[PDB]
Every structure is written in structure tokens, then in C-alpha cells.
From a paper:
SCD results from a single-point mutation in hemoglobin (Hb), where βGlu6 of normal Hb (HbA) is changed to βVal6 in sickle Hb (HbS). Under hypoxic conditions or in areas of low partial pressure of oxygen (O2), HbS becomes deoxygenated (DeoxyHbS) and polymerizes into long and rigid fibers, causing sickling of red blood cells (RBCs). While the primary interaction between HbS that initiates the hypoxia-induced polymerization process and the subsequent fiber formation occurs between the pathologic βVal6 residue and a hydrophobic pocket on an adjacent HbS tetramer, the stability of the fiber requires additional secondary interactions between the HbS molecules. Aromatic aldehydes, as exemplified by vanillin and 5-HMF, form Schiff-base interactions with the α-subunit N-terminal αVal1 amines in the Hb α-cleft that not only destabilize the T-state, but also stabilize the R-state to increase O2-affinity of Hb (pO2 at 50% oxygenated Hb, represented as P50).
To ascertain whether VZHE-039 binds as predicted, we determined its crystal structure in complex with liganded Hb in the R2 conformation. The benzaldehyde ring made both intra- and inter-hydrophobic interactions with α2Ser131 and α1Thr134. The Schiff-base interaction directed the methoxyPy group toward the αF-helix residue to make moderate intrasubunit hydrophobic interactions (3.5–4.5 Å) with the helix. The pyridine rings also showed extensive 3.7–4.0 Å π-π interactions with each other. Consistent with our design prediction, VZHE-039 made novel and strong hydrogen-bond interaction with the αF-helix using the methylhydroxy moiety. In the VZHE-039 structure, the methylhydroxy forms a strong hydrogen bond interaction (2.9 Å) with the backbone nitrogen atom of αMet76 of the αF-helix. In another structural difference, the benzaldehyde hydroxyl moiety of VZHE-039 (which is absent in TD-7) is engaged in a strong hydrogen-bond interaction with αVal1 nitrogen. Most likely, this interaction may have led to the differences in the positioning of the pyridine methylhydroxy moiety in the two structures, which in VZHE-039 allows close interaction between the methylhydroxy and the αF-helix.
Numbering used by the authors:
A (entry chain A), B (entry chain C): 1 to 141
C (entry chain D), D (entry chain B): 1 to 146
Write the structure that this text describes.
Amino acid sequence: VLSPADKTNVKAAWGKVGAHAGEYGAEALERMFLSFPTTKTYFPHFDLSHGSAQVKGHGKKVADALTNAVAHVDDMPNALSALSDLHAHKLRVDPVNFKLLSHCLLVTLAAHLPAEFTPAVHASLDKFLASVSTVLTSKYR
Amino acid sequence: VLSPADKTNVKAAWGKVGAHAGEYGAEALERMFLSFPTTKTYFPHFDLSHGSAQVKGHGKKVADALTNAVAHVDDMPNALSALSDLHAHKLRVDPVNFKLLSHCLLVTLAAHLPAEFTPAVHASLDKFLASVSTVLTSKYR
Amino acid sequence: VHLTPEEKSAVTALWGKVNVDEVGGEALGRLLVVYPWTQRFFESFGDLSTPDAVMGNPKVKAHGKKVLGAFSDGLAHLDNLKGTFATLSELHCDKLHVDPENFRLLGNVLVCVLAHHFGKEFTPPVQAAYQKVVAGVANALAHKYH
Amino acid sequence: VHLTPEEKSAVTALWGKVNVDEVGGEALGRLLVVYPWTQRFFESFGDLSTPDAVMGNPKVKAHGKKVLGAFSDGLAHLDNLKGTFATLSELHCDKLHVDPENFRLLGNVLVCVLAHHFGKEFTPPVQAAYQKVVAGVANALAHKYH
Ligand code: HEM
Ligand code: HEM
Ligand code: HEM
Ligand code: HEM
Ligand SMILES: Cc1c(O)cccc1OCc1cccc(CO)n1
Ligand SMILES: Cc1c(O)cccc1OCc1cccc(CO)n1
């Protein structure tokens, strides 16, 4: 459950990303794939080599979803019902993998936005990604 | 996130608990304290002896809060604001301990309600207790 | 190694009354239903679309027996769980890459199944003794991660 | 843990640039803020009521420096993390009864701080090497649980 401050922190921090959405998303994916090799087993049909156009384009998809989640932070289950059916019903992703990606997203933001990544904002961002993760791993339809 | 069926299962099962609320709540607590003695450190000034009146009193408090949560399953954060201001703000309970109590609650339900504890209702109750745990462990004020 | 003499006695006494042909299937089945992402590891097991399909799936019950047999092997060697589950640890960790947390979840699902069957007989001291069992099994199974 | 020669070089190079007066304190600090339940272990550390209070707390900065020094010892003895952290494991497990999950959280928090401090120099391969190290350290501390 996010506080009003959490929501403010998340919007401000993610608003700084802006045009770097695809880059940061792709970087976060590469970080997850390299740091935690077992996450690659969910992408067997993917080109997962470094510099992959496939990973690059998919990073953009993940970033845009996050941006949409920020926009509907008060209405996540309905707004993310689409991605939930994919990740929970079809893909059946282990929730631990969402923790890994969330961590790699935090690392990416810390690396690119040091002024934004304060302890409080760090906390809010972590809760936000944890929230998105819970929705995408829950079968609620 | 709970499905309509999840909400249906929880209400039907916890409704069957009825007046056995204070009993099951106390038993669940006693199962926690005994199976996981580290949880007792959260109750340093409690009489945690077997069958103590304080524990049975606390069990009824837990059970009634759960009954309240069931009635407000669509609006947990608001209904549980006070319980989230003394579990998350002052007692700062480690979320692992909520998994322990939630488990002991399921064990207690399974021990007393064999016909009600179907695999489907099992799964729904777990999600419900996880939701309550998430809300009580989060700082949204 | 842990488990007190009294805990070993309580675990042994109850386990002799356990249906080795059903409890395993019930445990694995409920694991797949309560934590649906676990179904991904059993894709060749057929129909896992609904709870009724899972619990009635012949392969799930069959594999459950194997799982329960391993728990039985653990209870006969309570002071050497890590050697008992050595081979299984390599399978689940190095080959299957099952996250350790799932080991703990199955152990606690088993605990619920035991409570569901024995009811009032599954007393808090009995549960407490079995909590150390399933934790020792989960740890031994994740040994190759350590 | 198992690092390639190229990974060991990159880890050592980055670690030699680490501000040993602040990085540890910021790591322990962010832990206490992002995961507030961890504050329970540090009651005697005075004011932890606000994020600013936690980061600026002299006892937090001091203790965080000891944490960082533990990681330094880990890096200098990667071939024997279990023996290196035997004393600390007995402390964090048998005495403090810290949950092993919290060990992983702190390790990952440190990674975030390193990324925060070094920016683009903390590349994904560099992170990958440090994830191996923190996993090994966290596993070494929970060794008395095994
Ligand atoms: C944590 C936040 C996450 C977000 C916001 C997210 C978002 C997305 C989006 C937007 C898509 C494309 C949906 C479409 O086709 O329109 C997708 C697909 C996918 N995601 Fe995620 N995801 C997340 C976590 C994860 C994790 C942790 C994993 C696995 C470790 C994962 C595995 C996959 C896979 C396998 C696909 C399908 C790729 C394909 O074949 O096109 N997701 N995700
Ligand atoms: C479903 C989960 C839980 C529910 C519904 C719940 C509910 C409650 C309720 C109703 C109270 C009494 C509030 C009052 O007196 O005004 C309470 C107090 C308390 N709870 Fe929980 N609780 C849960 C989980 C936990 C867990 C897992 C722990 C620790 C391991 C915990 C530790 C405490 C403590 C230390 C108090 C204060 C008692 C006192 O100092 O008198 N709670 N909780
Ligand atoms: C925690 C206690 C567990 C025990 C005692 C256990 C026991 C076993 C045993 C005895 C086998 C048979 C191995 C063989 O005959 O070669 C097996 C296989 C297997 N286990 Fe487990 N297991 C446990 C947990 C888990 C969990 C939590 C998962 C997944 C989330 C899992 C996934 C698998 C899979 C996918 C196989 C092979 C299935 C196949 O042949 O298609 N295990 N396990
Ligand atoms: C995961 C890696 C960790 C490392 C490398 C580490 C390192 C250390 C070190 C070097 C000490 C000093 C011991 C001494 O001087 O005798 C210490 C003490 C301590 N640690 Fe940890 N620690 C870790 C995790 C944790 C976590 C996650 C917690 C709590 C959530 C924790 C709680 C404590 C406490 C309460 C003390 C003693 C404080 C006091 O003396 O007042 N540790 N740790
Ligand atoms: C609020 C919260 C946390 O602090 C951590 C994990 C999940 C979580 O909530 C997830 C959730 C479920 C249903 C609806 C919403 C708000 O859209 N969030
Ligand atoms: C929906 C859900 C899960 O399947 C597991 C854990 C938490 C969770 O949501 C918790 C939550 C947060 C905010 C509002 C509500 C519904 O009142 N639930």
C-alpha cells in the first residue's frame, strides 16, 4: 500500500526518466540476465546476447508498462489486468524473478539518476515495483 | 489481488468459523509461539504460558480484526489503517512473521474445518492472509 | 543437527499413521493450486487448468508418492538430512533451478495437509516438531545453493 | 564464489575506489529506511525516527563502516567465505536470530549504493560480479542456519 508521498516520489522520480524509458528498461533487463542467468529461461526464443535489438525493444515495452502503472497507481489491478493474465496465467512466472528485475530497475535508476535516488524515494520505488509485481503474479480474474 | 471467487471462498469459510473466532485465533497464536519461538520476542510483557487468559484475549482480537477485514475485503487499507499504524509504524514487524502466523491460521482452520478446507478455499485464504499481511506491514501514512 | 528426543518421538509416532499413498499427492496438488507458478515446473504432467484437474491428475498423485517417499527417507535419517537429500538437491538446484522459497512452501503445505487429516490430533507440539522437519528438509534440498 | 579473472580485476578496481567512510553507512542506512523492520535490531542506536535521522546517525555510519569492512574481508578471502564469517554467522544467527532474507536485502542494498556512487562505471557485468560476491557473503552469514 502506497502513501500519498510514495505516489509523489514515484511520479517525480519516474518523470525524470522521460525519453530514457527504453534505454533504462533495456539496461534493467540486461542487468537481470547477466546477474541472474536463470531468468533467461523465461526467454528461450529471445536473442539475449548483449546489444540485442530484441532485448532493446522489449525494454521499451516494460518501461511503457511501468509508466502506465505510474499513471494508474490507484487503479493497478484493472490497468494491469492485461499484463497479469500474461505473467500469472500464461507465463506463470515465479514471484522471485520479479524481485530480481525490480532490484535491477532500482540499480539502473540509481546509476542514471543519483539526485533522484534518495533513501525515501528508494523506499517508495521499491514498494511501487513490489506492488506491480504482486498484481502481475496474482490470478484475480 | 483477490478474484471474485477468492472473495466468495473467504467469506464462506470464515463465516463458518463464527463464534469460534476467539478460540481459533488463540490456537493460531499458540501454534506460532511454539513452532517459532522467536515470534515471542514481539510480546515481551505478555503471559505466553499455555492456555493463558491474555493469549486467548489476544486471539479474539486477531480473529475479530480478520472478521473486519473479510467485511472490507474491497477496502482493506482504510479499514486496517490503525492496525497498520501499530504493526508497521511502532512494532515494525518483520513480514516473515506474518507468513508464520498466516500459516498457523491455515493449520488451525484445516484442523477444525476439514470439509471447508478444500484446495480452492485453501488457496483463497492464503491470498487473503497475504493481503492482510501486506497492508499491516506497509507504511502508507 | 537439531530435533530433540521428544520432537523425534512425536514425529515418528504420527508418521506411522500417515497414508503414504495419498498425503504426497495432496501436498503436491495443493502446492500447484495455492502457488500456481509452481505448475510451470510440471508442464508435461498434463491438465493443470483447474484445482479439480490438478488434484485428480494421475501424474501429480504418482509424483506425490515419490515426494512423500523422500520425506519418509528423511524421517529415518533425521540426523543426516543433508546426506539423505544430497542427490535431490543437485536435481532441484543445479538442473531444475527451483528457488529455495518453494522448498519451504511445499513443506508448509505438507503441514497443512497433516493438520487437515489428523485435525485435533495435530496438536501444537506435534506441529512444532514437524516444522523443524520440513525446515531441515528444505535446507537440505537447497544445500547446493549454499 | 567463482569469479573469472576479468571479473576479479573489475571488482578489485571498483572496490579500491570505495569511500570507506560513507558507503557502508549509506548501505546500512538505506536498509533501515527501505526495510523499517530491520530497525528493531538497532534499538540502542538512538534516533531512527526519520530517513534523515537514520542517514545522519553517527552510530549508523560507524556500524556501517564495520559492515563494509566485513565485505572487504570477504573479498580478500573469497575461497573461504564460510571460515571468514564463522564468527559473524554465530552472532547473526544463534544470538541475534536475523532472518536470512535480510542478509540478501542488505547485500542488494549495497549493490544499489555502489551503483549510486559510481554511476555508469557500475556496468551490468560489474554488477553481475558483485551479485556473486554479495550472494556468497549473505550465504556465509547464514551458514550456522544450515
Ligand atoms: C516487474 C515488472 C514487469 C513488467 C512491467 C513487465 C512488462 C511486460 C510487458 C509490457 C510485456 C509485453 C506485453 C505485450 O506483449 O504487450 C512483457 C512480456 C513478457 N515478460 Fe514481463 N514484465 C515484468 C516482469 C517480468 C519478469 C520478472 C519476467 C521473467 C523473469 C517477465 C517475463 C516476460 C516474458 C517471458 C514476456 C513475453 C516476451 C515475448 O515473448 O514477447 N516479466 N512483460
Ligand atoms: C493476520 C495477521 C495479524 C492480525 C489480524 C493482527 C491483529 C492484531 C490486533 C487486533 C491487535 C490488537 C490491537 C489493539 O490492542 O488495539 C494486535 C496487536 C499486536 N500484534 Fe498483531 N496481528 C497480526 C499479525 C501479527 C504478527 C505476525 C505479529 C508478531 C510476530 C504481531 C504482533 C503484535 C504485537 C506485538 C501487538 C501488541 C500487543 C500488545 O502490546 O498488547 N501481529 N495485532
Ligand atoms: C521440498 C521438498 C521436496 C521434496 C522432498 C521433493 C522430492 C522429489 C523427488 C523424490 C523427486 C523424484 C526425483 C527422481 O525420481 O529422479 C522430485 C522431482 C522433481 N521435483 Fe521435487 N521435491 C521437493 C520440492 C520441489 C519443489 C518445491 C518443486 C517445484 C516448485 C519441485 C520440482 C520437481 C520437479 C519438476 C521434479 C521432476 C518432475 C519430472 O520428472 O517431470 N520439487 N522431487
Ligand atoms: C548481510 C551481511 C551483513 C554483514 C556483512 C554484517 C556485518 C556485521 C559486523 C561486522 C558486525 C560487527 C560485529 C562485532 O563487531 O562484534 C555486525 C553486527 C551486528 N549486525 Fe550485522 N551484518 C550483516 C547483516 C545484518 C543484518 C541484515 C542485520 C539486521 C537486520 C544485522 C544486525 C546486526 C546487529 C544488531 C549487530 C550488533 C549491533 C550492536 O552491537 O549493537 N546484521 N554485523
Ligand atoms: C501496497 C503493497 C505493498 O506495500 C507491497 C506489495 C503489494 C502491495 O499492494 C499490491 C496491490 C494489490 C491490489 C491493488 C493495489 C493498488 O492498485 N496494490
Ligand atoms: C492482491 C494481493 C495479493 O494477491 C498478495 C499480497 C497482497 C495483495 O494486495 C494487498 C492489497 C493492497 C491494497 C489494497 C488491497 C485490497 O483492499 N489489497
